[PDB]
Amino acid sequence: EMEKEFEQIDKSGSWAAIYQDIRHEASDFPCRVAKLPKNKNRNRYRDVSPFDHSRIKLHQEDNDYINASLIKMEEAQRSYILTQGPLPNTCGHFWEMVWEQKSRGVVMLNRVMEKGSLKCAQYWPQKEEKEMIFEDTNLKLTLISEDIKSYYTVRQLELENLTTQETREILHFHYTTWPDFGVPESPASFLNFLFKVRESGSLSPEHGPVVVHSSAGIGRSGTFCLADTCLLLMDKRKDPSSVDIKKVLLEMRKFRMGLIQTADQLRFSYLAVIEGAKFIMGDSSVQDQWKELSHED
Ligand SMILES: O=P(O)(O)Oc1ccc(Cc2ccc(OP(=O)(O)O)cc2)cc1
Numbered sequence: 001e002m003e004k005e006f007e008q009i010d011k012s013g014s015w016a017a018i019y020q021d022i023r024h025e026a027s028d029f030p031c032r033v034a035k036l037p038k039n040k041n042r043n044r045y046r047d048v049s050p051f052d053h054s055r056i057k058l059h060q061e062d063n064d065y066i067n068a069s070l071i072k073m074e075e076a077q078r079s080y081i082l083t084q085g086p087l088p089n090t091c092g093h094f095w096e097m098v099w100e101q102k103s104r105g106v107v108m109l110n111r112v113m114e115k116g117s118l119k120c121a122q123y124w125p126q127k128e129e130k131e132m133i134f135e136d137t138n139l140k141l142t143l144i145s146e147d148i149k150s151y152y153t154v155r156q157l158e159l160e161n162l163t164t165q166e167t168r169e170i171l172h173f174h175y176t177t178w179p180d181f182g183v184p185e186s187p188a189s190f191l192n193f194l195f196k197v198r199e200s201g202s203l204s205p206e207h208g209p210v211v212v213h214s215s216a217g218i219g220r221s222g223t224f225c226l227a228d229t230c231l232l233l234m235d236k237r238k239d240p241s242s243v244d245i246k247k248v249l250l251e252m253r254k255f256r257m258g259l260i261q262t263a264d265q266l267r268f269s270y271l272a273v274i275e276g277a278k279f280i281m282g283d284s285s286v287q288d289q290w291k292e293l294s295h296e297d
């Protein structure tokens, strides 16, 4: 049971060892397509690639590769597409993926610039009057409105398939204060953000998989997805004790390598799930408390 176990691990100071054991048992599948010479420029990081079995294929006969993986959680009945922050040359592919997979929301857990370095391209419009056209994939993207809060911003975007003139509203959830290889300010800030995404319907089964990304699409992204899935699992059963956090992470790791990058992010996942369990188990008022504690204004 996660809380009891959280106590034992904490008291022993064994987060490093527990996290290392997870890395040790994690799946290892080939990424042949990711490593093809022609795809060199489609990967942000040499050491972070999508397994061939779970990679998202772009619908085109030219080059269908994009550094993105489909994390299909069978038991939880939820899927996510984890991807790297798009590069200057892969922005069109990114939106093509969003279009083809029928995603309703895009969760960004990083900033364009971190530690003096460009960790992701500016793939969405920053101003209403300056829309973006991706010539290669024939898509148009316009900023419709944005709600800026202290540590996150929600944007309403309009994605248009110029070939068919069909349009869709895409919701962009941008967490701007989560340091790479770091953790959110508090479980409250994280849960407040997660519940905003949930609240929007973006994580609902009637839509394609929500797209979740960070710079590499594995650390902060893995943390986000792990907490959400564990919460959904205990929600289905209304039984927090049926959830084995580590087992869940290993299951996700069958779909994309390196999910959750540090022992502290793992520890933070436990905290988020234990705190979130309060809402799942009947205390709906806790949601407004996270909102207050997050100081989003
Ligand atoms: O670049 P460094 O900071 O020097 O060390 C890293 C090396 C590789 C990664 C990605 C990565 C890490 C682990 C991984 O899977 P696993 O070995 O835990 O199974 C898959 C990708 C992240 C950090």
Ligand SMILES: [Mg+2]
Pocket: 127, 128
């Ligand atoms: Mg203006």
